[PDB]
Curated annotation (Swiss-Prot), chain B:
Mitochondrion in keyword set: yes
Enzyme superclass (EC): transferase
Family per record: Belongs to the TAM41 family.
Protein name: Phosphatidate cytidylyltransferase, mitochondrial
Annotated source species: Schizosaccharomyces pombe (strain 972 / ATCC 24843) (Fission yeast)
One annotated GO biological process: CDP-diacylglycerol biosynthetic process
Source species, domain of life: Eukaryota
Function: Catalyzes the formation of CDP-diacylglycerol (CDP-DAG) from phosphatidic acid (PA) in the mitochondrial inner membrane. Required for the biosynthesis of the dimeric phospholipid cardiolipin, which stabilizes supercomplexes of the mitochondrial respiratory chain in the mitochondrial inner membrane.
Whole sequence portion shown: 33 to 316 of 393
Catalytic reactions of this protein: a 1,2-diacyl-sn-glycero-3-phosphate + CTP + H(+) = a CDP-1,2-diacyl-sn-glycerol + diphosphate
EC numbers: 2.7.7.41
Biological pathway: Phospholipid metabolism; CDP-diacylglycerol biosynthesis; CDP-diacylglycerol from sn-glycerol 3-phosphate: step 3/3
Length: 277, 272
């Protein structure tokens, strides 16, 4: 619609996180998620097969107990898994060791007429990262546009503080004048190595600017309301511009002024998940 | 001293890492380092107390065994430790990460020094287990003791940081885009490890302030990089003082899929 509409979103009901695809695509992704009978608490779609305009579709399943989750899923979907064999001596992992921590991926899996890759991880591990940034490896993925296909309201609540913290890190890094393009590129930079480390994508990493410009409408929807709520941040463009601006439009970028006094920088710093006591 | 001279640096003797303060400051810093009888393998100076445009001077001490090092340091300087408001727990803390004593008076200076396992640093420089320690050394530091040992462990860290910048940037970019991108990679790590007692600075002010040292570190690496080349002619690079923030160099890199895959495969994050 318009950028002005995006400034009217209700943060208190997480409206800036409520990214959902078109009805038909959504139906397909939902059918994929529901195909799994092992209980998925939060299901995430992300990547080129979710944000379009054939390709493998990327998912994350946040589950209550991964060991048990894989026990069930090994019975229902045994051919989704491929294990390393014992060639030589050991490298023998237990259920808890291989499944209990991190993101475990089954890749190039056919589910309901789609080729998919899904990573399974502990919901508890994710929520702790969203709250404290223990590593930010999981949190960083959720500072950028994703689609929550299941457990939406529960997840959005846990993620709002992660998103506003990423904005605050951006504000700490940027000068008193910046464009929204500078902001989103800065925010993407924060998680760029973490996405590589976690193998969220089987394809080559992308250029930071291409990431931002392809998803410009979703970065605006997430962060413009947070900018609007932020004391000391001033939108420079007039009400007229913001009502004439399509969120999908890359041809011009909003500009801002922020307070960069010492007291302001101290409050940004001390509100970070890294600095909570 | 010109930008052109910076390209002719010998990467094989780590000349791009050989950042030393003017001889004035250097003796003071080295007397601070030598005041300590607990042995320090590698001593690092950084921060505004080191790169001067008095203030507290920031140090990192990389040591062979931090628990045995703090044992000796608790004997020579027990006032440095603020623990008398409460040892097993303190000792557990010594082991991992960086332990700091701050606002400490030494040889005329008010200093802050962090103690960390040299082994932990070297492993991070090589593998980016966390990049918390390696990130500090992707940016200008002064190595005050243990230079040749440390420069050689760090060179792969620096060119890896350049490679991440090249992955992140388009086919055309300036040296300003690149230094700011590199600083972005380690910005949260510097906060998490509390390298600085003061508020974090703005990325662009960090770069512009230290533009001569980012240039000394990274310009010869860009030069040796396949697929990357300078856009400005030999003559402009002779007319540029490394401290001049009024003009920034430009670059063209190959961005084909194979070039990008080569940069990804050589990062420290790969287990192979
Ligand atoms: Pt639109
Ligand atoms: Pt169980
Ligand atoms: Pt079971
Ligand atoms: Pt079980
Ligand atoms: Pt929209
Ligand atoms: Pt304490
Ligand atoms: Pt060219």
């Amino acid at each position: 619609c318009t950028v002005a509409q995006l400034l009217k979103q209700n943060l208190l009901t997480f409206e800036n996180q409520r990214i959902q695809p078109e009805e038909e695509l959504k139906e397909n992704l939902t059918k994929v998620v529901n195909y799994f009978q092992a209980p998925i608490d939060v299901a995430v779609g992300y990547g080129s097969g979710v944000f379009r305009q054939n390709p493998m579709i990327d998912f994350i399943f946040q589950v209550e107990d991964p060991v048990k989750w894989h026990k069930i899923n090994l019975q229902q979907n045994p051919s989704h898994y491929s294990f390393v064999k014992n060639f030589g001596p050991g490298f023998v992992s237990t259920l808890q060791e291989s499944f209990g921590t991190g993101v475990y991926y089954n890749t190039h899996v056919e589910v309901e007429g789609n080729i998919i890759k899904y990573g399974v991880t502990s919901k508890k591990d994710v929520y702790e990262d969203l709250k404290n940034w223990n590593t930010m490896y999981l949190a960083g993925r959720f500072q950028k546009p994703v689609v929550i296909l299941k457990g939406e309201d529960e997840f959005y609540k846990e993620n709002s503080y992660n998103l506003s913290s990423a904005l605050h890190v951006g504000l700490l890094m940027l000068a008193d004048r910046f464009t929204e393009f500078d902001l989103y590129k800065t925010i993407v930079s924060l998680s760029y190595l973490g996405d590589i480390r976690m193998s969220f994508f089987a394809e080559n990493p992308r250029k930071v600017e291409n990431i931002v410009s392809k998803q410009i409408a979703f970065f605006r929807k997430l962060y413009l309301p947070l900018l609007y709520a932020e004391p000391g941040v001033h939108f420079i463009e007039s009400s007229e511009v913001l009502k004439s601006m399509d969120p999908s439009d890359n041809s011009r970028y909003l500009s801002f002024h922020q307070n960069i006094t010492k007291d302001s920088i101290s409050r940004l710093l001390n509100g970070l998940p890294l600095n909570l006591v």
